[PDB]
Amino acid sequence: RADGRNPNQLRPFSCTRNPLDRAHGSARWAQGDTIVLAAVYGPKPGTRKGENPEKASIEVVWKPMTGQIGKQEKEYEMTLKRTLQSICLLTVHPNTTTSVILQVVGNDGSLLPCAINACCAALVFAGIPLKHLAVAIGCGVLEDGEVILDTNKAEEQQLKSFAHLVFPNLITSITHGVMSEEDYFSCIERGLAASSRISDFMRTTLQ
């Protein structure tokens, strides 16, 4: 690949443990130049009037690195909320609201998978009960089916197929552009065997 990685290679990731003093848990998560800040606010008593108070609430606001949220970063906001509500164990702290704020710092590709991983780390740090870890990976599909892991901004302007996969340690998957069923399986096959690198990071280094 242009940047010198091979197809199954994840760009180097990193994380500063809770930069924010006011947050119960936070994570500035970086993969290459794509960097994100995730802030979580412990479980807070009470439930939005339009929610169920019988189960715990998870809420999310996606904030652009500048200006205000466009049609793309607001579907990301949506996917992220689906994914987080999914992995969180909701039966532990009923009548409670956990608010996640995601602030984009840089965007060199795989922004939604990055924001996902960032948020999984911050939840863990805030002591929010999870069913399992969420490990997300942006997969790109090359001309004749060659699968690429953790695409950047440049590869995202080149390829015609790709998938956002998130594995439990699937959870959710969203594909963009042409995707044969063979392409799709290569992506899940490839992503899965790579994902253990991200969760080994969450399970050891980040604790």
Coordinates of all heavy atoms in Angstrom, one line a residue, residues 5 11-15 28-37 62 65 76 102-118 150-154 156:
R5 N 2.1 -0.2 4.4 CA 1.5 -1.3 5.1 C 1.1 -2.4 4.1 O 0.9 -2.1 2.9 CB 0.3 -0.8 5.8 CG 0.6 0.2 7.0 CD -0.7 0.5 7.8 NE -1.8 1.0 7.0 CZ -2.3 2.2 7.2 NH1 -1.9 3.0 8.1 NH2 -3.4 2.5 6.4
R11 N -2.9 0.3 11.2 CA -2.0 1.4 11.5 C -1.7 1.5 13.0 O -2.5 0.9 13.7 CB -2.5 2.7 10.9 CG -3.5 3.4 11.8 CD -4.8 3.7 11.0 NE -4.7 4.8 10.0 CZ -5.7 5.5 9.6 NH1 -7.0 5.2 10.0 NH2 -5.6 6.5 8.7
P12 N -0.6 2.1 13.4 CA -0.3 2.0 14.8 C -1.4 2.8 15.6 O -1.6 3.9 15.3 CB 1.1 2.7 14.9 CG 1.7 2.6 13.5 CD 0.5 2.7 12.6
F13 N -1.9 2.1 16.6 CA -2.9 2.8 17.5 C -2.3 3.2 18.9 O -1.3 2.6 19.3 CB -4.2 2.0 17.7 CG -4.0 0.5 17.8 CD1 -4.0 0.0 19.1 CD2 -3.8 -0.3 16.8 CE1 -3.8 -1.4 19.3 CE2 -3.6 -1.6 16.9 CZ -3.6 -2.2 18.2
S14 N -3.0 4.1 19.5 CA -2.5 4.7 20.8 C -3.6 5.2 21.6 O -4.7 5.4 21.0 CB -1.4 5.7 20.5 OG -2.0 6.8 19.7
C15 N -3.4 5.5 22.9 CA -4.5 6.0 23.7 C -4.0 6.6 25.0 O -3.3 6.0 25.8 CB -5.6 5.0 24.0 SG -6.9 5.6 25.0
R28 N -8.5 9.6 24.4 CA -8.1 10.2 23.2 C -7.4 9.0 22.4 O -6.3 8.6 22.6 CB -7.1 11.3 23.3 CG -6.2 11.5 22.1 CD -5.4 12.9 22.2 NE -6.3 14.0 22.1 CZ -6.0 15.2 21.7 NH1 -4.7 15.5 21.3 NH2 -6.9 16.2 21.7
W29 N -8.2 8.5 21.4 CA -7.7 7.3 20.7 C -7.2 7.7 19.3 O -7.8 8.5 18.6 CB -8.9 6.3 20.6 CG -8.7 5.0 19.9 CD1 -8.6 4.8 18.6 CD2 -8.5 3.8 20.5 NE1 -8.4 3.5 18.3 CE2 -8.3 2.8 19.5 CE3 -8.4 3.3 21.9 CZ2 -8.0 1.5 19.7 CZ3 -8.2 2.0 22.1 CH2 -8.0 1.1 21.1
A30 N -6.0 7.1 18.9 CA -5.4 7.4 17.7 C -5.1 6.2 16.8 O -4.5 5.3 17.3 CB -4.2 8.3 17.9
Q31 N -5.5 6.2 15.6 CA -5.0 5.3 14.6 C -4.4 6.1 13.4 O -5.1 6.8 12.7 CB -6.1 4.4 14.1 CG -6.9 3.8 15.3 CD -8.2 3.2 14.8 OE1 -8.5 3.2 13.6 NE2 -8.9 2.6 15.7
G32 N -3.1 6.0 13.3 CA -2.4 6.9 12.3 C -2.8 8.4 12.7 O -2.8 8.7 13.8
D33 N -3.2 9.2 11.7 CA -3.5 10.6 11.9 C -5.0 10.7 12.2 O -5.4 11.8 12.5 CB -3.2 11.4 10.6 CG -1.7 11.7 10.5 OD1 -0.9 11.2 11.3 OD2 -1.4 12.5 9.6
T34 N -5.7 9.6 12.1 CA -7.1 9.7 12.5 C -7.2 9.6 14.0 O -6.9 8.5 14.6 CB -7.9 8.5 11.9 OG1 -8.0 8.7 10.5 CG2 -9.3 8.5 12.5
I35 N -7.5 10.7 14.7 CA -7.6 10.8 16.1 C -8.9 11.3 16.7 O -9.5 12.3 16.1 CB -6.3 11.5 16.7 CG1 -6.7 12.2 18.0 CG2 -5.6 12.4 15.7 CD1 -5.5 12.6 18.8
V36 N -9.3 10.7 17.8 CA -10.6 11.0 18.4 C -10.6 11.1 19.9 O -9.7 10.5 20.5 CB -11.6 9.9 18.0 CG1 -12.5 9.5 19.2 CG2 -12.4 10.2 16.7
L37 N -11.4 12.0 20.5 CA -11.5 12.0 22.0 C -12.9 11.6 22.4 O -13.9 12.2 22.0 CB -11.2 13.4 22.5 CG -11.5 13.7 24.0 CD1 -10.7 12.8 24.9 CD2 -11.4 15.2 24.3
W62 N -22.2 13.3 18.5 CA -21.0 13.3 17.7 C -20.7 14.7 17.3 O -21.5 15.4 16.8 CB -21.3 12.5 16.4 CG -20.2 11.6 15.9 CD1 -20.0 10.3 16.2 CD2 -19.2 12.0 14.9 NE1 -18.9 9.8 15.5 CE2 -18.4 10.8 14.7 CE3 -18.9 13.1 14.3 CZ2 -17.3 10.8 13.9 CZ3 -17.8 13.2 13.4 CH2 -17.0 12.0 13.2
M65 N -14.8 18.1 13.9 CA -13.6 18.8 14.3 C -13.7 20.3 14.0 O -12.9 21.1 14.4 CB -12.3 18.2 13.7 CG -12.0 18.6 12.3 SD -10.9 17.4 11.5 CE -12.1 16.4 10.6
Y76 N -22.9 8.6 11.4 CA -21.9 8.0 12.2 C -22.4 8.1 13.7 O -22.2 7.2 14.4 CB -20.6 8.8 12.1 CG -19.8 8.4 10.8 CD1 -18.7 9.1 10.4 CD2 -20.2 7.4 10.0 CE1 -18.0 8.8 9.3 CE2 -19.6 7.1 8.8 CZ -18.4 7.8 8.5 OH -17.8 7.5 7.3
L102 N -18.3 12.3 21.6 CA -17.2 12.0 20.7 C -16.7 13.2 19.9 O -17.5 13.8 19.2 CB -17.7 10.9 19.7 CG -16.6 10.2 18.8 CD1 -16.2 11.0 17.6 CD2 -15.4 9.7 19.6
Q103 N -15.5 13.6 20.2 CA -14.9 14.8 19.5 C -13.9 14.4 18.5 O -12.8 13.8 18.9 CB -14.4 15.7 20.6 CG -13.5 16.9 20.0 CD -14.4 17.9 19.2 OE1 -14.2 18.1 18.0 NE2 -15.3 18.5 19.9
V104 N -14.1 14.7 17.2 CA -13.1 14.4 16.2 C -12.0 15.4 16.2 O -12.2 16.6 16.3 CB -13.7 14.4 14.8 CG1 -12.7 14.1 13.7 CG2 -14.8 13.3 14.8
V105 N -10.7 14.9 16.2 CA -9.5 15.7 16.3 C -8.8 15.7 15.0 O -8.4 16.8 14.5 CB -8.6 15.2 17.4 CG1 -7.2 15.8 17.3 CG2 -9.2 15.4 18.8
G106 N -8.8 14.6 14.3 CA -8.2 14.5 13.0 C -8.9 13.4 12.2 O -9.5 12.4 12.8
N107 N -8.9 13.5 10.9 CA -9.5 12.5 10.0 C -8.7 12.1 8.9 O -8.6 12.8 7.8 CB -10.9 13.0 9.6 CG -11.6 11.9 8.8 OD1 -11.2 10.8 8.6 ND2 -12.8 12.3 8.2
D108 N -7.9 11.0 9.0 CA -7.2 10.4 7.9 C -7.7 9.0 7.6 O -7.0 8.1 7.2 CB -5.7 10.3 8.3 CG -4.9 9.8 7.1 OD1 -5.3 9.9 6.0 OD2 -3.7 9.3 7.3
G109 N -9.0 8.9 7.8 CA -9.7 7.6 7.4 C -10.1 6.7 8.5 O -9.6 6.9 9.6
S110 N -11.0 5.8 8.2 CA -11.6 4.9 9.2 C -12.0 5.6 10.5 O -11.8 5.2 11.6 CB -10.6 3.7 9.6 OG -10.4 2.8 8.5
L111 N -12.8 6.7 10.3 CA -13.2 7.6 11.4 C -14.3 6.9 12.3 O -14.2 7.1 13.5 CB -13.7 8.9 10.8 CG -14.0 9.9 11.9 CD1 -12.7 10.2 12.8 CD2 -14.5 11.2 11.3
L112 N -15.2 6.2 11.7 CA -16.3 5.6 12.5 C -15.7 4.4 13.3 O -16.0 4.2 14.5 CB -17.5 5.2 11.6 CG -18.8 5.0 12.2 CD1 -19.3 3.6 12.1 CD2 -18.9 5.4 13.7
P113 N -14.9 3.5 12.6 CA -14.3 2.5 13.4 C -13.4 3.0 14.5 O -13.3 2.4 15.6 CB -13.4 1.7 12.3 CG -14.2 1.9 11.0 CD -14.7 3.4 11.2
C114 N -12.7 4.1 14.2 CA -11.8 4.7 15.2 C -12.6 5.2 16.4 O -12.3 5.0 17.6 CB -11.0 5.8 14.6 SG -9.9 6.7 15.8
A115 N -13.7 6.0 16.1 CA -14.6 6.5 17.1 C -15.2 5.4 17.9 O -15.4 5.6 19.1 CB -15.7 7.4 16.4
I116 N -15.6 4.3 17.3 CA -16.1 3.2 18.0 C -15.1 2.6 19.0 O -15.5 2.4 20.2 CB -16.5 2.1 16.9 CG1 -17.7 2.6 16.1 CG2 -16.8 0.7 17.6 CD1 -18.3 1.5 15.2
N117 N -13.9 2.3 18.6 CA -12.9 1.8 19.5 C -12.6 2.7 20.6 O -12.4 2.3 21.8 CB -11.6 1.5 18.7 CG -11.8 0.5 17.6 OD1 -11.2 0.6 16.5 ND2 -12.5 -0.6 17.9
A118 N -12.5 4.0 20.3 CA -12.3 5.1 21.3 C -13.3 5.0 22.4 O -13.0 5.2 23.5 CB -12.3 6.4 20.6
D150 N -8.1 -1.2 7.8 CA -7.9 0.1 8.4 C -7.4 1.1 7.3 O -6.3 1.5 7.3 CB -6.8 0.0 9.5 CG -6.8 1.2 10.4 OD1 -7.9 1.9 10.5 OD2 -5.8 1.5 11.0
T151 N -8.3 1.4 6.3 CA -8.0 2.3 5.3 C -7.8 3.7 5.8 O -8.4 4.1 6.7 CB -9.2 2.3 4.2 OG1 -10.4 2.5 4.9 CG2 -9.2 1.0 3.5
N152 N -7.0 4.5 5.0 CA -6.9 5.9 5.3 C -7.7 6.8 4.4 O -8.6 6.2 3.7 CB -5.4 6.3 5.2 CG -4.8 5.9 3.9 OD1 -5.4 5.5 3.0 ND2 -3.4 6.0 3.8
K153 N -7.5 8.1 4.4 CA -8.3 9.0 3.6 C -8.0 8.8 2.1 O -8.9 8.9 1.3 CB -8.0 10.4 4.0 CG -8.9 11.5 3.4 CD -8.4 12.9 3.9 CE -9.3 14.0 3.4 NZ -8.8 15.3 3.7
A154 N -6.8 8.5 1.8 CA -6.3 8.3 0.4 C -6.9 7.0 -0.2 O -7.4 7.1 -1.4 CB -4.8 8.3 0.3
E156 N -9.5 5.6 0.8 CA -11.0 5.7 0.8 C -11.5 6.5 -0.4 O -12.7 6.3 -0.8 CB -11.5 6.3 2.1 CG -11.4 5.3 3.3 CD -11.7 5.9 4.7 OE1 -11.9 7.1 4.9 OE2 -11.7 5.0 5.6

